Amino acid sequence: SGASEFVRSCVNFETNVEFTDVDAYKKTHTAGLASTFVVILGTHAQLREDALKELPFYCPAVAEAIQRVKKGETYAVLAEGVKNEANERFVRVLVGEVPSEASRTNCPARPDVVASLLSAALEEIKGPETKVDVFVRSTAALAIAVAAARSAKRNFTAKEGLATRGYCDNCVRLTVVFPTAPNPSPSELAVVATSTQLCQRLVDAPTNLLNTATFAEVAQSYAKELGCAVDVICGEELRERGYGGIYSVGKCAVEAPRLVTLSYKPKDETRKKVALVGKGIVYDSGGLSLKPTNFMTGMKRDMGGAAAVFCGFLTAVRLQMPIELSCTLCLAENAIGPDAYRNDDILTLKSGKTVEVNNTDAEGRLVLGDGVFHATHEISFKPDVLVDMATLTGAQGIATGHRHAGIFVNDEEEELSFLKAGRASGETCFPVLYCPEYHVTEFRSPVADMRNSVKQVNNASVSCAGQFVANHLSPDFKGKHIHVDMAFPAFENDKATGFGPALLTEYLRNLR
Amino acid sequence: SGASEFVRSCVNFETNVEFTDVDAYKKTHTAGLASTFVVILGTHAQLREDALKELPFYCPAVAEAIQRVKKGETYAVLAEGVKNEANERFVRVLVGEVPSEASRTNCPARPDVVASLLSAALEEIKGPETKVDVFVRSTAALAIAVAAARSAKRNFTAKEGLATRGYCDNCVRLTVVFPTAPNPSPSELAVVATSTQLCQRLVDAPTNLLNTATFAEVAQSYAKELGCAVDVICGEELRERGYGGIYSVGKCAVEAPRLVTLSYKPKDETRKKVALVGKGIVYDSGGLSLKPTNFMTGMKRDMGGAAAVFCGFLTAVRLQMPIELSCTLCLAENAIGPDAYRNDDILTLKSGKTVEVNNTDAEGRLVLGDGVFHATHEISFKPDVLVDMATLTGAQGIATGHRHAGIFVNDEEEELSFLKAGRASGETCFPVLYCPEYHVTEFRSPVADMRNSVKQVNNASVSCAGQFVANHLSPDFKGKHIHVDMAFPAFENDKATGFGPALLTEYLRNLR
Amino acid sequence: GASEFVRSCVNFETNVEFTDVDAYKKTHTAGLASTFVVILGTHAQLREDALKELPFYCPAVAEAIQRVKKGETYAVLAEGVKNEANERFVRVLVGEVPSEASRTNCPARPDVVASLLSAALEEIKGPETKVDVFVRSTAALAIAVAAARSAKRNFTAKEGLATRGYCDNCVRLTVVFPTAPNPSPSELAVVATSTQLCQRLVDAPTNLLNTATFAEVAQSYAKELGCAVDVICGEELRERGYGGIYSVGKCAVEAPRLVTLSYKPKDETRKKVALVGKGIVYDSGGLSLKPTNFMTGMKRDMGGAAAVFCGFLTAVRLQMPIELSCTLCLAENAIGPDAYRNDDILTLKSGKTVEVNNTDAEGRLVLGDGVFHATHEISFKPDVLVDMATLTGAQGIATGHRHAGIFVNDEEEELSFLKAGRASGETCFPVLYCPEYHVTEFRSPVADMRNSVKQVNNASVSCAGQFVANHLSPDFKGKHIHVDMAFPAFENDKATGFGPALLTEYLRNL
Amino acid sequence: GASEFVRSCVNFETNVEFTDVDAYKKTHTAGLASTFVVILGTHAQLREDALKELPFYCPAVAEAIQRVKKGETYAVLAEGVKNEANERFVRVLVGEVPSEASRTNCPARPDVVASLLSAALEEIKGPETKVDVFVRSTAALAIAVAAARSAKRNFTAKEGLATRGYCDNCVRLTVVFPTAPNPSPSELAVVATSTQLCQRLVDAPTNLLNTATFAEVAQSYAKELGCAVDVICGEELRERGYGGIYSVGKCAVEAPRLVTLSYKPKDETRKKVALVGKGIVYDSGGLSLKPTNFMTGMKRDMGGAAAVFCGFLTAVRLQMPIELSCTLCLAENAIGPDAYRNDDILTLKSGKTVEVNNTDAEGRLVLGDGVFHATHEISFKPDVLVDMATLTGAQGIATGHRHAGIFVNDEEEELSFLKAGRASGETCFPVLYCPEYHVTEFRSPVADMRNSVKQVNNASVSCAGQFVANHLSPDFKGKHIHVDMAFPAFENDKATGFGPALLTEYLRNL
Numbered sequence A, B: 001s002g003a004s005e006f007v008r009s010c011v012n013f014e015t016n017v018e019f020t021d022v023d024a025y026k027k028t029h030t031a032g033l034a035s036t037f038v039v040i041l042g043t044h045a046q047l048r049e050d051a052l053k054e055l056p057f058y059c060p061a062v063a064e065a066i067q068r069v070k071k072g073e074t075y076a077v078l079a080e081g082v083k084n085e086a087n088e089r090f091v092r093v094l095v096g097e098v099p100s101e102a103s104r105t106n107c108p109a110r111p112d113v114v115a116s117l118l119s120a121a122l123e124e125i126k127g128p129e130t131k132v133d134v135f136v137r138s139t140a141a142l143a144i145a146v147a148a149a150r151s152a153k154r155n156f157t158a159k160e161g162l163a164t165r166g167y168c169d170n171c172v173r174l175t176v177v178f179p180t181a182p183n184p185s186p187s188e189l190a191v192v193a194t195s196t197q198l199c200q201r202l203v204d205a206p207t208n209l210l211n212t213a214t215f216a217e218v219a220q221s222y223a224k225e226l227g228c229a230v231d232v233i234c235g236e237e238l239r240e241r242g243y244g245g246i247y248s249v250g251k252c253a254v255e256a257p258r259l260v261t262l263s264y265k266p267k268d269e270t271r272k273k274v275a276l277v278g279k280g281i282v283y284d285s286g287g288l289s290l291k292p293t294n295f296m297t298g299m300k301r302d303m304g305g306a307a308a309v310f311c312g313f314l315t316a317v318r319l320q321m322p323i324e325l326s327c328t329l330c331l332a333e334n335a336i337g338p339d340a341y342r343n344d345d346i347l348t349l350k351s352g353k354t355v356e357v358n359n360t361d362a363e364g365r366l367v368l369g370d371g372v373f374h375a376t377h378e379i380s381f382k383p384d385v386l387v388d389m390a391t392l393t394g395a396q397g398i399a400t401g402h403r404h405a406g407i408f409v410n411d412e413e414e415e416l417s418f419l420k421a422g423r424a425s426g427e428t429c430f431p432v433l434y435c436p437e438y439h440v441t442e443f444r445s446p447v448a449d450m451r452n453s454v455k456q457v458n459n460a461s462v463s464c465a466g467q468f469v470a471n472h473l474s475p476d477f478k479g480k481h482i483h484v485d486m487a488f489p490a491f492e493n494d495k496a497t498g499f500g501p502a503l504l505t506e507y508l509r510n511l512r
Numbered sequence C, D: 001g002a003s004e005f006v007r008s009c010v011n012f013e014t015n016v017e018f019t020d021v022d023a024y025k026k027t028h029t030a031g032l033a034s035t036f037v038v039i040l041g042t043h044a045q046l047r048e049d050a051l052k053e054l055p056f057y058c059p060a061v062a063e064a065i066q067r068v069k070k071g072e073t074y075a076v077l078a079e080g081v082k083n084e085a086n087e088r089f090v091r092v093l094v095g096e097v098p099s100e101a102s103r104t105n106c107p108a109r110p111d112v113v114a115s116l117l118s119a120a121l122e123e124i125k126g127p128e129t130k131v132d133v134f135v136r137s138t139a140a141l142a143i144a145v146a147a148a149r150s151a152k153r154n155f156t157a158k159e160g161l162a163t164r165g166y167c168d169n170c171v172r173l174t175v176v177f178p179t180a181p182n183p184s185p186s187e188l189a190v191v192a193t194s195t196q197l198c199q200r201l202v203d204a205p206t207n208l209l210n211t212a213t214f215a216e217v218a219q220s221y222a223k224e225l226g227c228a229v230d231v232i233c234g235e236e237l238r239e240r241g242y243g244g245i246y247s248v249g250k251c252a253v254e255a256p257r258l259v260t261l262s263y264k265p266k267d268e269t270r271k272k273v274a275l276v277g278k279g280i281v282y283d284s285g286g287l288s289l290k291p292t293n294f295m296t297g298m299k300r301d302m303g304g305a306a307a308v309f310c311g312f313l314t315a316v317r318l319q320m321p322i323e324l325s326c327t328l329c330l331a332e333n334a335i336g337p338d339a340y341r342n343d344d345i346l347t348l349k350s351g352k353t354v355e356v357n358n359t360d361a362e363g364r365l366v367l368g369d370g371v372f373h374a375t376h377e378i379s380f381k382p383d384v385l386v387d388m389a390t391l392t393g394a395q396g397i398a399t400g401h402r403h404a405g406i407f408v409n410d411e412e413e414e415l416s417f418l419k420a421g422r423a424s425g426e427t428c429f430p431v432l433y434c435p436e437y438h439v440t441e442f443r444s445p446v447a448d449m450r451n452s453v454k455q456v457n458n459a460s461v462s463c464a465g466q467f468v469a470n471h472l473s474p475d476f477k478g479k480h481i482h483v484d485m486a487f488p489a490f491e492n493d494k495a496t497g498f499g500p501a502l503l504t505e506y507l508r509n510l
């Protein structure tokens, strides 16, 4: 308990966001607004459409709010004479103006601002299960769903004794109201929102609750619930079976490292075969390459890639997508102590390749190296596409920024396809240089096949960490490889975003 | 053994300083000076009083020394024709001139210079139990006692095989000779001096001798000797009973953390009720927020606050003060290893409040938080005053300096009363800002009730560490809270000072 | 560029006016004189019956009062409120001020008044838009300051405002107290004017406000106010033995200057005060060059001079019964071939020699010459010397962002100054006064003293104060108040105008 | 010293000539025209039958081909090979070029051609020694560049070569393609000349190549080429509102200058391009002074200006059908009393105000004035603006040593530019184009923007591009290509001449 309550919370998790449309809303609630707190979000043009004037909260104060609000900001009023289920004299209404401007590399619905406007609005909300209606004028259903899900205040939290109430402040029930029946459907969006939120909680959970054993436990429960096969290679079995990357990185920790692989073969298919691999470093101390304090804070999030692929998988099974899937979680804690793998130790990864460790804090690529080899050589099928996701490098932020995950991809078409999924999902990406001939030289070793950390830090370092992982692909793998460095997109204002699963979901959804 | 010899040394400890006056000295020693080494300390004016000319070591060379000595310095002569018990032809006499100038924030007797003059004089002394007479012209008995006690070379030491002789160089027996019978009395001053010296030894003992178990052992022995009740919550009992601050900080160490509480109910009373709480970090590595070498040296002293409150308590029981007292020692070693509490872990202190750890090297406030809650909510009485003492922040030195402990106090009167005890004892203090409304914001957490380390280091950081401790006061506590940051005053010239107990003793002595 | 900033400072008038509920009701008989209203009060003050009688009170405002959170605003559109403009809606912001305040803080909590008001005024776009701020606190002076510093008269060069006096004139404030205030509205307006002028001086960049343009501003005010003014500039500083300020500033493009203003009141008085201020218009560090992230904001290293200058300005304008000198220690601490070196030995005006061991500890050098000038070179004998400066990073560590550290040689006067801090909202807190421990940190083997401490962890705020005290005239038997206001000079990366009101309140009660 | 370097640049001619196997066989009927031969090809190319027909082929060369390793050279003495000199032995180096190349790289792998050739030429001692380089690749332009930059025409002041134009003339190269190349040999020679001139400009130290001597070189070329040239120097920059470039450079001994060349082609064309280049002849950091190990190599901070200048030079010489302006933003970022400060507020030519928060982010300031000049102050309306600069250390982190980072506002043009990178061997790769996220990193409370990012870990290469884009004329509706070439400008601590060929290829295909 403490941990087993967090586990129970993850296993049963439902979202607090529902989706509908204006017409269905008007048919279901003819006895007034079903809430007393309303957020209306749209562009300058969308907020002046005639249809707005027919919405159940519209009144002269709301019309004034629309005239006064600034681009990128909310404007709040108390609306009088709006009939509502609670029979309040006043309904709280917040108008948020979303910019219309978006670059070619961004989601044109600007869910980044939808999220921040919504977040700011929901800070007024005190009480338990307070019903909030969010009327949105965008029809970009998936992107709005994600934004709403990640702003709905279902984050992990241990404030005020909430450890006893599933580490959750249940202060809001959201209803998102689209102009017309959305595509995807409300039931699809709810699955997506659920995965976004579950991912968010997994990431911001501290390591004293979410460690390698409790993460594995969650995945085992989902596997049983979902009818999926699950394989766990734990501890000494990793050493005995030659998985020296993940074993060495994790052997020092109190809870043993584990490679957890889930499988899904759809009922009637199969359109493609995809292996997912995720970096599940439940805490990163640095090992003997110990991080300073201000770089060690937030390293509970170093399992973000594992949470992403796990929650993406979860969504794919739940939406019964016609794709055969494996999901491999590379679970370890990078600890410091007498047993810690050393700067100079030589490891033999499952691939058979030897690695001279020159930075113990470059540990994620080691666990991934064992993971991608496992996915491409040790499992029941031959994937057409391998996607690995990880919170890998500080350099990622320097290169592609806080809101675009860096992608290292060995095929131009599949890179474009993935970027497209980023833009539709709002979980945006951008390419880093793919040039194996320049990256491989950064890991020259005089005593092993390679080192794990670059000789020069100023030579496409996001790409080189990708290349290191690629070095442990099975030599028979002729498929597409998408490597995702999501170090910074995994969080915003010092809170987890749930980034990854929806990007992934949208990508898989569009495979043929 | 090694450790058990240090323990035996602490348990039986007596001082090597005695106190008397000129008249009693002349009645007891009519067969000449009882020593051949004499130190005479006074201001420029005090050294020219007529009474000096009647003192048993006075002679023309001593008169010349008085004329030539410089303010703040000693001047040594060999005095011929002074009759003495040893029948030496020459008596060594050192004249030390103490400045008369003192600020309103300082002890007007300037024991700081008394101590340094005496220390310098005692460096001439080689042999065993060499008798030294120190004639002082100040009547500030308590301050002189402390200065003398801390300069008498009864420090911890392991030089030259002295591990077998109680880790003590017994090179000096001091007699301090006041102008007239002192207030406090010689027997009172001897108790004070004993506590000052015991505190000095505790602080400068290395952790391989004084750890959480051997400190507890010392306290248990004193409790039995003194007729005081003692309560020990050790190891897993701390975890099981919800003391998650002190437990987590200390769980990684080889010797388990412990909360040790002593109690004293006087025979006939009670004038006030006082809880003492002390930071007993027997070594501070930093934990995962590992200190660099030059900040890790001297961290054997991170138990100074526990030594202070323990030795103050000791003095109060021995002088049979009319005050009900608890003394809680918060004992832990802040170690590094696989089991170390992490930067991101969330702890539940005994207070029920959750703490997100953002610096494992801000550990003292965690152990104190459990300590002050224990003192204000878990013990047999309701204190009127809580005093916590600790070597807390480097900032303390920046703010109030090497010789003034920083005090964070929630009541103006009690702060003044405490400053007054500082000035009388020579163990001087100075206030840091008390402004809870500004401090509490420095520990905002997105996932717990609070963080443990400030967001900004340049915003009254000595005060904020005080506020953190205050956050875990029992919500029913309506009393006075005195928080003492004594990081720098705990040592001088790279040796422990024994700071704390006399300050404390003087404060308790004057309560009504 | 610079002469437009100068003209802007010289002619400066506040945008804040003060009144009370009763006078407001008598003058504005057609309803509210504005369509944007802020009402600020404690939880209790916001539930008094008197609130219900105020001209913006209505059911939406009542609901706002019920929903607002402590320390936050809650905005509504109020319908059916009579207003001069006959708008259907009046914008009303309810701000709840905490009632809780420590013994070291202003009990009216102007810190939160200022942040609530500032947040409310972000909604105001257009030119000279009228805003009424109804406050339930009677702490007039503290409210005035908070309002003044939040009224958006800050220095700014955005959007071509260089041509409009480097000022976005988007707001006219009227502050409405429950009853006629003490001090009076005309007094509060002078205070507010000085707060705002100080704010603009501090946040002006050095390419506009250098040693010559600051001196120019002071010279203009002196002429306007009938005050005598003395300027010792450049080589005159060297020739006359002011080697502290001269050496610190001699490398800069614009020469160092000691500028001293004097005021003898119309009516006789006994109280005599010298003010001395650190006017380092920019601090590069000199050869002890600051890294970039410590060099940003060093345009504010003249905050102490701005404080004393604006306090002086208030005292003259209110005709306070105190004889006053105000010495501005103006220099730019530059780097170059001519820069004073780490090892150079300087002879300050006091005749004491100083071995420079950190060229970035320059403020105490210019102050050392300043305080000697004020205590020995000057036509009168001050009873009190107050020096104000943005001196040490340590100040923040010790006393924090909102409390200036004070080093004071007299207990009573220190309490008196703390009291002025609490009444003005420009709060202070003591640092250790113990000369016997500070003086040892500046031992030199070749000069009377060094300028920088040997140990940084030994009451360093206090030691910088002690250094300045070392150059007091040996005649001076008076009270010395040293104010380290490094952090209180700014908030959210904008100048606060801290200093002048603290000072004004102290002088007012002397 | 300086005028000898100037004369050297003005009269510069390449030492590389281009031909093909058939023309070589017709002209050199007495056998090989050299006694030092390099043969470079892939594993497959080196085993074709055609190799056996080449004039240095013999059994030792055949053995060399069998033994050489991928990415390395293998040297022999070839006996019995007919040569003009009738030497018994001809020195022959076989270099195997990898065939593998990523989609982001030049498939002829000129990176390895260059390093193989460079290694081979280390064996060459004497003056004007003839070397034949037989290449099996038909990627003419990429080979030309590689050869040009490896031909040992670098700047050098070793062994008194200051008197011999700062040039070790130890090699004459003849590059022999399999068939008559496209582009033609006379075209490749112009390209090679520009590559080499660019190389020399970059690695020249600032005591030779400052703002005046660079301007002098450009003025000479303009006269020689019949191109108009405009120079705005020193106080004319201040007086005319070019406060970015003026402020950055005003502290230096040699005044800042905006130098703009123009070319209208003989034959009519529609395509109009403005080039703008960062010409920071030395970057100390200014008051944000660089540490020594970051200050070394900052003579190369004018690489972008050299690139655009040498590209322009090529375009004029090949008579390309494109109207061209070339603006060199020349300044030295110096430290001293007059240095622009961290906090100063500048007014760029665009009229936008900039609060300086890092004086070492100076290149974007000079470029901001440059791109505004090109888009608003100039006789024509460019369809495309290309700015080139050695901007950020982050560039290397993001896109590496051999790929310049490109920030481009149009997808198609970005692809077009990447394609020119791959054909030229002077390769690029995109950085994130997302203005809506970049602009927030330069929020200022007192000016339109800051110059340095608030967060360093938020697409910092892209944000420096965005800063420059902020000073584009608001009229400008065209394509903007921003090139951060900080690391590709050098290799093994020697200038590469990167930029001009990339540029030339892009313009050629426009």
Ligand SMILES: [Mn+2]
Residues within 6 Å of the ligand: A284, A286, A334, A360, A361, A362, A363, A364
């Ligand atoms: Mn790591």
Ligand SMILES: [Mn+2]
Residues within 6 Å of the ligand: B284, B286, B334, B360, B361, B362, B363, B364
């Ligand atoms: Mn610590």
Ligand SMILES: [Mn+2]
Residues within 6 Å of the ligand: C283, C285, C333, C359, C360, C361, C362, C363
């Ligand atoms: Mn300075």
Ligand SMILES: [Mn+2]
Residues within 6 Å of the ligand: D283, D285, D333, D359, D360, D361, D362, D363
């Ligand atoms: Mn620079």
